[PDB]
């Protein structure tokens, strides 16, 4: 009651090939749903469309979410990663919760009363058997703050289940979290547990210096032949076959061992407002995968370059993680109030999102039938394809749980990060019913492992830097109101590798 | 040595894995026309949120589909796999522009993509994919 149940740890220790990052924050937990499990469905909120239909529950339990990078890395630390390293991946997670303080409010007339409640408890437990839904993969808000001095609020835990419209079905599952053995903490207890990440492939934080189709030697001729001329000239019965040697003169036709990865085309919209069509094509014209008669928008989509080299005004409609600048409203914000990330780096080995994958010959030529081709809008995996996965921005997610299923292909999640079949367990918390809320400290520590840049490239790399032009306020810092603002999203890919 | 057979129906659908009470930090493209200024083009973003769940960015997508014809007279896996009589979804055929409307077309067959998950229902060869028989 009178002695600190834990200490304050925030720092980063760069040791050899490993990195140890520790983040500590101060949180507040209110009471949700008046200590009740409450059913929720769109019928409560008006239930406009069948696409948006959901059936689920809301629990008083709150949960801790550290799933975003900027929780762990200060901007400068992050810089020391993207600049010097060709890869990273988490090894150990060590979580601590302590210094619980339970407060109670008896409101009398205008001024409310707040004082310590000593005998109150705060229940906390983790789901390490994965019997509960896993909501930490969808990039929800409520995570630890980017800036240490920010005191935050634990999000409310909710989940959804099978449904037809707002009605339920027999197979819908209802989980009571009280049914779980959980630790109970008074103002002197603390909570701690450690976690060992399962083996995941290094995330790549390098940009290929070569393009998939230029891997050739420019000085030498292949020994493969291609068909140059099917006629000599104009006339009657001019058909002929003329093979040439593929070589540096014409490089488009050479035989190649590998081909770019999969593509599902996104509609491309311009940031100059007037190059866009004068109609509402936001939902009607967007790409979307359909499931059980419910249409789903394809966001962010498979990993594909955002635009052709040299044109940057345009962006794929849903094909890009779109963050937002601080102060950005929650509705109908302008084009510049959002920060639209673009995959410039992965264009070399991956198809462009807003372009076709290619052509196919759609009929059989004869004297009476021309060769007819048609575009490939969507292209799935073929033998030989190589591709790069989406980058992880400093604001983006770290991991996501792989839905437990029969099979999967390349589980790495589409918003970035590390797909895992046993991700870091959820951490649930609530105030035991006895008006009540609790507060305290949370320190989370992940140990990251590195892959150093070994390359022999002669000229200097492109590195991430901070400008020097006398701005009113420094980037990644506070304004005069103490508002920590992250001005631009930071890719992980600066150093270069060969293809 | 074969994988343990799965004999259960998933409680939740693939697209609904979200937390219904909390917004994502990601934005989607809500509104492409003003409508007040007599259809001046405009570009507006809004938070993907539980109010509109169709638009939220998802980490995984349903498995492959190769369409069949519906005849009138496997419904348990309808969570992670598309309906055999319905299109997999839409793609955009052309670039929009001021003089051309955005066009979309149906995906009748869809191969594997990175990030697909699916539920189920060997030759001697150089390669196969997911050998589990049909």
């Amino acid at each position, epitope marked *: 009651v009178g002695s600190s149940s834990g200490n304050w740890h925030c720092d980063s220790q760069w040791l050899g090939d490993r990195v140890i990052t520790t983040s500590t924050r101060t949180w507040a937990l209110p009471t949700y749903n008046n200590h009740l499990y409450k059913q929720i469905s769109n019928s409560t909120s008006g239930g406009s469309s069948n696409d948006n239909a959901y059936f689920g529950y809301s629990t008083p339990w709150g949960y801790f979410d550290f799933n975003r990078f900027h929780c762990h890395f200060s901007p400068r630390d992050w810089q020391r990663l993207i600049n010097n390293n060709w890869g990273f991946r988490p090894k150990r997670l060590n979580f601590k919760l302590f210094n619980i303080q339970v407060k109670e409010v008896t409101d009398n007339n205008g001024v409310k009363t707040i004082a310590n409640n000593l005998t109150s408890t705060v229940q906390v437990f983790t789901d390490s058997d994965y019997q509960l839904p896993y909501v930490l993969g969808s990039a929800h808000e409520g995570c630890l703050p980017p800036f240490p001095a920010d005191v935050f609020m634990i999000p409310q835990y909710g989940y959804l289940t099978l449904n037809d419209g707002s009605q339920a079905v027999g197979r819908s599952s209802f989980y009571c979290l009280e049914y779980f053995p959980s630790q109970m903490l008074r103002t002197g207890n603390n909570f701690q547990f450690s976690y060992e990440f399962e083996n995941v492939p290094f995330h790549s934080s390098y940009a290929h210096s070569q393009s998939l189709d230029r891997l050739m030697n420019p000085l030498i001729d292949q020994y493969l032949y291609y068909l140059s001329k099917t006629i000599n000239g104009s006339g009657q019965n001019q058909q002929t076959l003329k093979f040439s040697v593929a070589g540096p003169s014409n490089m488009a036709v050479q035989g190649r061992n590998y081909i770019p990865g999969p593509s599902y085309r996104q509609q491309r919209v311009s940031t100059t*407002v007037t190059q866009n069509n004068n109609s509402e094509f936001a939902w009607p014209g967007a790409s979307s995968w359909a499931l059980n008669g419910r249409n789903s928008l394809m966001n962010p989509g498979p990993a594909m370059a955002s635009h052709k080299e040299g044109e940057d005004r345009f962006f794929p409609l849903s094909g890009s993680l779109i963050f937002g600048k601080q102060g950005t409203g929650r509705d109908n914000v302008d084009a*510049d109030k959002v920060m639209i990330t673009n995959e410039e780096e992965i264009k070399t080995t991956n198809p462009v999102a807003t372009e076709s994958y290619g052509q196919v010959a759609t009929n059989h030529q004869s004297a009476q039938a021309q060769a007819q081709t048609g575009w490939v809008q969507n292209q799935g995996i073929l033998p030989g394809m190589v591709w790069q996965d989406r980058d992880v921005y400093l604001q983006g997610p770290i991991w996501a749980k792989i839905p437990h299923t029969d099979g999967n292909f390349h589980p790495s999640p589409l918003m970035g990060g590390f797909g895992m079949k046993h991700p870091p367990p959820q951490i649930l918390i609530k105030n035991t019913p006895v008006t009540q809320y609790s507060t305290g400290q949370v320190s989370v520590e992940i140990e990251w492992e590195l892959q150093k840049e070994n390359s022999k490239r002669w000229n200097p790399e492109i590195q991430y830097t901070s400008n020097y032009y006398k701005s009113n306020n420094v980037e990644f810092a506070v304004n005069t109101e103490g508002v920590y603002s992250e001005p631009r999203p930071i890719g992980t890919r600066y150093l270069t590798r060969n293809l | 040595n074969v994988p343990f057979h799965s004999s259960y129906a998933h409680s939740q659908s693939l697209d609904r894995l979200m937390n219904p009470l909390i917004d994502q930090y990601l934005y989607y493209l809500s509104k492409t026309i003003n409508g007040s200024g007599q259809n*001046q083009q405009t570009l507006k973003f809004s938070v993907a949120g539980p109010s509109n769940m169709a638009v939220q960015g998802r980490n995984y997508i349903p498995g492959p589909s190769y369409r069949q014809q519906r005849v009138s007279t496997e419904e348990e896996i309808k969570t992670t796999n598309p309906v055999a009589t319905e299109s997999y979804g839409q793609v955009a055929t052309n670039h929009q522009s001021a003089q051309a409307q955005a066009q979309t077309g149906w995906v009748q067959n869809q191969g594997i993509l990175p990030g697909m998950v699916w539920q189920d229902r060997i030759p001697h060869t150089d390669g196969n994919f997911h050998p589990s028989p049909l």
Partner: antibody
Amino acid sequence: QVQLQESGPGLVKSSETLSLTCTVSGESISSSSHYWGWIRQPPGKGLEFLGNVYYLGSTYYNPSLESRVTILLDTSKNQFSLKVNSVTVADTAVYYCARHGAGSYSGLFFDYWGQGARVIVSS
Amino acid sequence: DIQMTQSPSFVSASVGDRVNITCRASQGINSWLAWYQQKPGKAPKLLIYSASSLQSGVPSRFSGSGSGTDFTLTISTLQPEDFATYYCQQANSFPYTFGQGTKVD
């Protein structure tokens, strides 16, 4: 508030490249998310657009000018440079720098303008 | 390109008297416009963006409503502070074009 200053030579020999630079104070080109563009005012005549450059480096040029103009974006020093090649007597006017965008009208109407820069092409 | 022609080339109208300047786009611009004001020798400054939406800096007196092939800038209660040329701009399609100029007196 966004103050825009142009600098460079005020006299250029004919068929010598022309170079001006606009150093924007009050915003950060990398994180402002607005278009930056040039126009030119041949004396006593209507202004004609030259081109603009989006903050990521993409560029639009005016076809009337025939592939002479090139707009380079130096983001670290927070300034962008106009370069027009093979200058002639006809290509002499006051060159304005401008911020091409706003919330609703980004890359359309020029809200904030340079002080102006006189360039006289002569032999 | 799309031409822009402001109908009065030189409109001499003194203080207090209402003035209206009209510029017609060669082809429909879908109400995308931008009237500007240039006092002699200084760079121009924006006045009305889109069709009728006033800029924050500019005084309430300036106004104008385009039908999309027709546009007018009505300077109401003209004060002596502004005698300047006036340009209009299309935003509809590249390249952006500023027609002529309307010098007012």
